[PDB]
Amino acid sequence: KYEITTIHNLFRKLTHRLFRRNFGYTLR
């Protein structure tokens, strides 16, 4: 339950807003 089910809570901003500026995809 870390993929997205809960990731949405850890997401810095929203989902893909600025998840490519410094931290690409930490959910992987």
The rounded distance, in Å, linking the Cα atoms of 24 and 16 is 9
Residues in Cβ contact with 2 at an 8 Å cutoff, skipping those fewer than 6 apart: 27
Which technique was used to obtain these atomic coordinates? NMR
Q: Please tell me what DSSP assigns to residue 7.
A: H
Distance CA(12)–CA(27), nearest Å, equals 11
Name the strand (E) or helix (H) holding 19. Answer: none
SS3 content of the chain, % helix, strand, coil (to 5): 15, 0, 85
Contact indicator for 13, 19 with CB cutoff of 8 Å: yes
Structure tokens at 6: 């809960």
Q: From CA 18, how far away is CA 2, in angstroms rounded?
A: 19
In angstroms, how far is the first alpha carbon of the chain from the final one? 12
> Within 13 Å of residue 17, how many CA atoms lie on the same side as its CB?
6
List the structure tokens of 26: 């930490």
Q: In this structure, are residues 19 and 11 in contact, taking their beta carbons and an 8 Å threshold?
A: yes
